Write a protein that holds these residues in place. Sequence first.
Motif, mmCIF file in Angstrom:
data_model
loop_
_atom_site.group_PDB
_atom_site.id
_atom_site.type_symbol
_atom_site.label_atom_id
_atom_site.label_comp_id
_atom_site.label_asym_id
_atom_site.label_seq_id
_atom_site.Cartn_x
_atom_site.Cartn_y
_atom_site.Cartn_z
ATOM 1 N N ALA A 63 0.815 -1.210 0.000
ATOM 2 C CA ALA A 63 0.000 0.000 0.000
ATOM 3 C C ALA A 63 0.853 1.266 0.000
ATOM 4 O O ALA A 63 0.444 2.289 -0.563
ATOM 5 C CB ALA A 63 -0.943 -0.003 1.204
ATOM 6 N N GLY A 64 2.030 1.222 0.623
ATOM 7 C CA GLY A 64 2.898 2.376 0.733
ATOM 8 C C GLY A 64 3.774 2.658 -0.464
ATOM 9 O O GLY A 64 4.262 3.787 -0.614
ATOM 10 N N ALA A 65 4.012 1.653 -1.314
ATOM 11 C CA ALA A 65 4.832 1.873 -2.504
ATOM 12 C C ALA A 65 4.237 2.932 -3.421
ATOM 13 O O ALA A 65 4.980 3.836 -3.846
ATOM 14 C CB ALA A 65 5.061 0.547 -3.233
ATOM 15 N N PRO A 66 2.943 2.895 -3.777
ATOM 16 C CA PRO A 66 2.429 3.944 -4.668
ATOM 17 C C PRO A 66 2.365 5.299 -3.992
ATOM 18 O O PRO A 66 2.501 6.317 -4.676
ATOM 19 C CB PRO A 66 1.035 3.429 -5.051
ATOM 20 C CG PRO A 66 0.641 2.560 -3.926
ATOM 21 C CD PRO A 66 1.904 1.894 -3.474
ATOM 22 N N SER A 81 7.791 -0.471 0.248
ATOM 23 C CA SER A 81 8.279 0.902 0.149
ATOM 24 C C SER A 81 9.800 0.989 0.245
ATOM 25 O O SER A 81 10.394 1.961 -0.237
ATOM 26 C CB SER A 81 7.631 1.761 1.236
ATOM 27 O OG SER A 81 8.101 1.395 2.520
ATOM 28 N N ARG A 82 10.451 -0.022 0.830
ATOM 29 C CA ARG A 82 11.909 -0.007 0.939
ATOM 30 C C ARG A 82 12.602 -0.113 -0.420
ATOM 31 O O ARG A 82 13.569 0.611 -0.687
ATOM 32 C CB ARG A 82 12.366 -1.147 1.854
ATOM 33 C CG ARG A 82 11.928 -1.016 3.310
ATOM 34 C CD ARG A 82 12.278 -2.263 4.116
ATOM 35 N NE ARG A 82 13.584 -2.807 3.752
ATOM 36 C CZ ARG A 82 14.742 -2.367 4.237
ATOM 37 N NH1 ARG A 82 14.762 -1.373 5.115
ATOM 38 N NH2 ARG A 82 15.881 -2.919 3.841
ATOM 39 N N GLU A 83 12.152 -1.023 -1.286
ATOM 40 C CA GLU A 83 12.747 -1.073 -2.622
ATOM 41 C C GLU A 83 12.478 0.208 -3.407
ATOM 42 O O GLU A 83 13.356 0.679 -4.135
ATOM 43 C CB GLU A 83 12.300 -2.315 -3.394
ATOM 44 C CG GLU A 83 10.910 -2.278 -3.924
ATOM 45 C CD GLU A 83 9.912 -2.704 -2.900
ATOM 46 O OE1 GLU A 83 10.255 -2.776 -1.702
ATOM 47 O OE2 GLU A 83 8.770 -2.955 -3.300
ATOM 48 N N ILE A 84 11.265 0.766 -3.311
ATOM 49 C CA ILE A 84 10.988 2.022 -4.005
ATOM 50 C C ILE A 84 11.942 3.111 -3.524
ATOM 51 O O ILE A 84 12.510 3.856 -4.332
ATOM 52 C CB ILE A 84 9.522 2.449 -3.803
ATOM 53 C CG1 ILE A 84 8.547 1.357 -4.226
ATOM 54 C CG2 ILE A 84 9.219 3.628 -4.708
ATOM 55 C CD1 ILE A 84 8.679 0.951 -5.657
ATOM 56 N N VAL A 121 4.100 8.543 4.003
ATOM 57 C CA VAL A 121 3.689 7.173 4.302
ATOM 58 C C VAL A 121 3.287 7.032 5.765
ATOM 59 O O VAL A 121 2.300 6.357 6.082
ATOM 60 C CB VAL A 121 4.782 6.162 3.893
ATOM 61 C CG1 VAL A 121 6.012 6.257 4.779
ATOM 62 C CG2 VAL A 121 4.223 4.746 3.906
ATOM 63 N N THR A 122 4.017 7.675 6.682
ATOM 64 C CA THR A 122 3.648 7.568 8.092
ATOM 65 C C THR A 122 2.333 8.294 8.357
ATOM 66 O O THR A 122 1.487 7.812 9.124
ATOM 67 C CB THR A 122 4.776 8.081 8.999
ATOM 68 O OG1 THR A 122 4.461 7.780 10.365
ATOM 69 C CG2 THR A 122 4.990 9.576 8.864
#
Lengths: 198, 198, 198, 198, 106, 109, 80, 82, 97, 98, 95, 95
Positions: F35-38, L62-65, L89-90
């Motif tokens: 969910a956080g990647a986009p 989200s770490r790879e991004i 994100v937080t």
Amino acid sequence: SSSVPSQKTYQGSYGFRLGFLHSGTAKSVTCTYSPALNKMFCQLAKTCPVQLWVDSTPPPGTRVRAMAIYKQSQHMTEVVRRCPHHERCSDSDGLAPPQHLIRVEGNLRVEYLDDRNTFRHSVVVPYEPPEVGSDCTTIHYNYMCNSSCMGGMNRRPILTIITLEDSSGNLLGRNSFEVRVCACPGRDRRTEEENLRK
Amino acid sequence: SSSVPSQKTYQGSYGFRLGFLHSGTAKSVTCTYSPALNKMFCQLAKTCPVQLWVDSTPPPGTRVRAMAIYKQSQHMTEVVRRCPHHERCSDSDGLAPPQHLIRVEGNLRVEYLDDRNTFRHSVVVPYEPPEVGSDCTTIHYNYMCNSSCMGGMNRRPILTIITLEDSSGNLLGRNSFEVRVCACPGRDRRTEEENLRK
Amino acid sequence: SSSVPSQKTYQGSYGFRLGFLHSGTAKSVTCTYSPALNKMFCQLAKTCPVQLWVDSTPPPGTRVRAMAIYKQSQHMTEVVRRCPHHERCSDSDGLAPPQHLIRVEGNLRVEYLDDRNTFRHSVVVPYEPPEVGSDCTTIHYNYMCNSSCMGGMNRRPILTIITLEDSSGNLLGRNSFEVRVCACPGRDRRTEEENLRK
Amino acid sequence: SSSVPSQKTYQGSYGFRLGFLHSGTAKSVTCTYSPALNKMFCQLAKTCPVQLWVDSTPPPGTRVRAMAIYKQSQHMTEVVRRCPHHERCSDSDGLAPPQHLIRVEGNLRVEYLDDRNTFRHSVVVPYEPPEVGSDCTTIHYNYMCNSSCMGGMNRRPILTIITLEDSSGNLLGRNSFEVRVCACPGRDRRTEEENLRK
Amino acid sequence: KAKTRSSRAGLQFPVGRVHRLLRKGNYSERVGAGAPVYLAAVLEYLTAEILELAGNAARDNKKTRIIPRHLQLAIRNDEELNKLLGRVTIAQGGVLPNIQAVLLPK
Amino acid sequence: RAKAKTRSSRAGLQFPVGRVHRLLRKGNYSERVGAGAPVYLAAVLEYLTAEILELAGNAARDNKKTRIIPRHLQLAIRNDEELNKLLGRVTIAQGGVLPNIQAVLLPKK
Amino acid sequence: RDNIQGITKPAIRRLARRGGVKRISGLIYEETRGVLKVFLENVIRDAVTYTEHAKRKTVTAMDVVYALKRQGRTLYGFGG
Amino acid sequence: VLRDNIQGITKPAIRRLARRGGVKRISGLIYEETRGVLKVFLENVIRDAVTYTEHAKRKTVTAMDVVYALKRQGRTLYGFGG
Amino acid sequence: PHRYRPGTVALREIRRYQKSTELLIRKLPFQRLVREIAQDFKTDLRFQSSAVMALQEACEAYLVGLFEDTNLCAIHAKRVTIMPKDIQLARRIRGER
Amino acid sequence: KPHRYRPGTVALREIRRYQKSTELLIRKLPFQRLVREIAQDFKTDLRFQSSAVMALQEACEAYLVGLFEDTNLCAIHAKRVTIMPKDIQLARRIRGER
Amino acid sequence: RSRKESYSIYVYKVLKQVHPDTGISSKAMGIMNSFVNDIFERIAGEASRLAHYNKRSTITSREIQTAVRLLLPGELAKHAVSEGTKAVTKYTSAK
Amino acid sequence: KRSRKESYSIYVYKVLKQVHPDTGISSKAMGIMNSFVNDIFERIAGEASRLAHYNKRSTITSREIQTAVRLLLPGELAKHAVSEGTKAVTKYTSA
DNA sequence: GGACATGCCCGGACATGCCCTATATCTGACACGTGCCTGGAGACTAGGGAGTAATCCCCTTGGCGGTTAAAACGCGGGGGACAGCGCGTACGTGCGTTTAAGCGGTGCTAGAGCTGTCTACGACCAATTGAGCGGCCTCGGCACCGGATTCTCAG
DNA sequence: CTGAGAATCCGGTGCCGAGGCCGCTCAATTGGTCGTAGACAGCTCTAGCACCGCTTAAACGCACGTACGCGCTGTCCCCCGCGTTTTAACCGCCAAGGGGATTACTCCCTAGTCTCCAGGCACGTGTCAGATATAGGGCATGTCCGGGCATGTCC
């Protein structure tokens, strides 16, 4: 020797030329001349007639000198002289020094020179115009070693240089011929003439 | 010379004989001996081995002398010597006088004599007994002119006379052989041997 | 040596060139020259004729010098000299120092130089023009070691450098040729010429 | 030399004999012995093992000496020495004088003698009885010139004479063998063995 | 008995392995049956070409085993392979023995 | 049912979280996407857009222009070391090049 | 054919001017033409390959955009 | 902390590299520029390698990290993994 | 004594090192440099052997290629000696500078 | 006498003029004819979208401008001003296109 | 007993097919594996992008063929397409 | 009425109005912005996918991004983007 | 005079130098065998993506005309490319020194790698609806024109 | 300093494309469920780091000579810049058709699952090619000598 005598033919003012007899080639002949080779073939101590021809008569006091040199360039500076054996044998004619290769026979006015500067030997006589009725003056040389004499000519060919010179020794004319002194002049002359075709 | 050395074979008290190697007759073998002719054929200045054989050993101080003489009776009184050319050339080994025909090679104790009374040349060395485990003593001679040298041997055959002497010159034994010094010992040996049949 | 002599061909003002005889390649011909290789092949101590050609005659006092150097660049600074054996043997002609490779034969006016600065040996003679008829002057060199002599040239090829100099030793002209001193010049010449095709 | 060393085999009181390795006759052979010829064939400066065999042990202080002489009788009096080139080259092992032909390798107690009276060179080491495991003592010689060296052995065959001596150089035994020092011992051994049949 | 697609096709590279690597590479949701056959076949062809040239270079070098140097020679000497691998560095490959003409002595 | 509000609004962003998420799902990148990647991706894209648009606006006002044209975008990209590095291999259509003359080409007195 | 001459001498001069050059040798023009032509061969090849894979008969702007992108120079302004 | 290790890239090493590149003569002033260039390369490559290492929750840079970094910088290297 | 002409030994060394494949940069100083630079990126890093060998292979290939291009640019200017400006031109035209 | 600028002044003026603007410098239709000609050598009877030719033209001019920038830098490096074919060949060789 | 992934046996069979007298070192084998994996990734990636651009969800032989034509040079592309087509046709007949 | 064609035009305009309330945008420039955003999207998504694959990871997180952004973006740009992403994100997770 | 007598020269061929190459010994790394296990092959299923056919329209191709700006061509000249020359200095080469790189052995511990577990998290699916896109309209930013102002260049 | 050519700026007019609004539709959101994957714990065991010691080859400092970079000068040629002629690029306007995009129907092609089995990959092992030195094997090149010629001799 420090030097080498010039051998260039030079007829000069008096038109000086040499002539030779027509002797054939019997192996035993004492002296025979080859026109093809301009070469005399003769036996040791035998008479070798050489004719002096001139177009006009040189002045009184003119002299005729004969000297030998080796024909091959590398031997040219070596004085031509008799071998130790013939030098020592007892054949002097009372006139010629024992070590001189070339003698003149039948001339009381012959002189033998051992040149102090060049160390060359030579024999000189006064020039005499031909006897009346003759066209040339003949000189009679003797060669006192064979071309083959060990410790002497040692099988090396020589030239005889004949010079016409004035009373100071200045050059009036010059001619030369090759000489082989050998036991069988006729045999050796035919052999060298034949080898011309080879 | 006023005299002629005796040539008579004399084996004497010690049974003195000569021996020679079996060298064949190759055209230019340096040294070859002919039993038929009792004649050595050798080249100038080359080693010529001569063996001395005795039945019993001569005393210490005994010497071996070699001398040449002309073989033909009319020449016998003429001293055999080197010719004028070889006499003068620069080939002395530091030991032999220039005019001696016969030299010994490889012996520091060699002596050369010119006899004041006879005028003969000779070469002498001390006789050395063969090792008790041996049969003969070999001496090595050199002949310093060809038999044909003009002013020297002049084509006359010679003999070499080998004498066994005491310290004083007293005759203990004598042997001899003919010698021809020549350019082609094998050729010349075969020719003379053939002529024996003629 | 501290230096290396130049080998650059330089005909100079007098049009100085070398010439050589046409000797063939018989197995043991004494001296034979290869136009293909610009290389002389000759036997030890034998006569090696070298012709000097000029378009016009250099002044009196002009000299001709010969010097050997090693042909291979890494040996170029090493002085060419005789081997210890030939240096010691007794073959000096009375004129040449024992260690000089190159001699001139038949010239009383020969000089041998051992250069104090370069340590190079050379042999020099006065230049003599030919007679007005003749077209060149011949000098006769002798090489006194084989190319193969151990402790000497040790099988390394050499060049002979011939220079024409004025009386002060200043350069008038220069030419050179390779040299092989060997027992069988004809054999060796044909071998090297054949190898050119390989 | 004033004298010639005896070469007579003498086994003496101690039954002194020589022995040699069984090396074949191949290429890359540095030392090979021929029983047929009693001749060692070896390369220059290579190890040549010679075995000393005795029936009983000689006293302490006994020495072993090696000396070369020319084999041919006419050369026997000439001292065998190195040629001028090898004499001068820089190959001394710190122990042997430069002119000595024969060296012993691997022995600190080696002595080289230049005899003041005979002028002969020789090399001597103390005799040591055989090592545990062997019935013979081996000495390792080096020969420092080829038989062919010009100015040296000059292609003349030599003998090596091995003498068992006391402290005062008195004779206890003697043996000898012929030596050829050459580039290809195997080739040359087979050639000379073949020629035995010729 | 089981017989593989490579065996039916007469090829050396494994159809199954190439197929699995395509399926697991997150490239597409479906893969056709012929696609891994084609891809494996192209890989054989390219491998054969490179090994052919590298073997040739090895024989020219009197070597019986191909080394990285021979691979570099093969790739850089062939015009089309060098283009295909224009931005590729082969380790222990070295460079071609190429010298500019102007730098040669006169 | 609760009032519908978008993830972009929840994150304080302008780029569409839903659309970026769908494009990630359908771009054949992976079977699963967090969910956080986009959200992160949308934030980076918005940031880069804001900086490029800021610089292009600056250039536009420097040229007394109120409308952004490709020339202003090219100038903005090339005048920023980090944007120029990021877009080192990108050609802008109708962008032209930066005015620049090498010193050796200028006339001399 | 002859159409390479439609990229005229003043056109190559103008492109070179935008490249910042002050003087242009006479030998420059053919060289530029060759370089341009090679570029086109490679680009058009890729574009037509894409067009044929799509079973189309007309090369589109998008075909060109993909060709340029894969050639290593991304072009902005024509889609994608 | 290692300090002044840049001096370990010696002058003859850079000369050898230039020889392999076909360079016949090298100015004395070449070396500092070459060192700078080398340094630049390292700061970029290592940055990517360490970034990958940290993402992978590792503290040791692996050969695959470096090969991948080189690939993503267009200088793909063969021989340490694909 | 003997002295080689300027240029022959340089060419000999070029041929020598282009014929063979051994690495030309010393292992230990290269590793030390890599570790030094690394401290300023992340603390107390550990490096695999094949990782340092990878960095060294990449670095030597990059420098050899850059020196090839530099030599081509120098020769283009009718020169033989490479200059700093040559390096800067090569890197600018390659597009990293 | 009529006015004439010294060599270079007008060159710089056109440089400034064409570096300030972005309008295309190569003619549309001759380029279009070339592209279609070159294309039939790959596939006959091929068509082209208008925006496709304009894209190709934009790409070509950007490519040529960059190549001419690099060529100019190489010329200046050699203390020269006028660019020649060997300059183009060096620029493309160093870029890795040859 | 950590199973890995390499084409070693297949590379060796092809090598024996083309040259059944030559071996290969470990470094050389590593270079061949790196090469093959790199090509694979390049071709598969281009085919994947080709399929996505054309709204295709399946990897088929036409995208592979087009990708090969894009990536391989002239003669290499022609020979590869010929070998691939013959091989795929023979497999399809063999089923 | 044509097919649904997606673009970022309205989002580019909203960001522009945030950063420059009185500045507009031309169609060509908007097209350039869309090309830019799509290009960055492709680069980041592709690198993140590759990163995840390399590490045997099956989920996009989200770490790879973030790591991909750090690889592709320069230094200060990366720091600012990472800061913005983490805060965003937080904040989202708080909801 | 012919038939030998007798020395000299040298090509043949061997003596014997030297390098020249191809055949005899190590090592770890590569080529083959084995066991196993897990990934690939055969078989069956659904379902949905792709193939195919008809349609429409838009957008690409082709043509005509003018007109004008750009391309082509000529020519004068000047300045820049290029060849030649001098110099001086910086770099290539060699040698003695020293310095550290390399290799081999040894330790240990940090950390890579593998396995087990489980829970959080993302795929999937249905209903909703509101965000985003296509279409239409308008007005203001920009573009085109012209003329005065300023800049800049060269004589 | 000044005149002339080009660029810049300022204002006026128009136009057409960007911005906004509205209908619609489909794609994102929300809510719930379920499989699975990766986060964490824990154990193993590999290899990276650290160190010591010895060796020796590489680096380094310096001396020296000289080749090349660089600055200067002259030349000539060929590119720029401008005037004149030509031509074709572009803009506008119209016609046609063909192919690209769209939709609907179908079918077959591939993912998914199961079952099995064989191939490929750790582990193990042995032996073969790389360097050196010894055996053939060629050339590398001097010395000796038989043959054949050169030349004296004489009944």
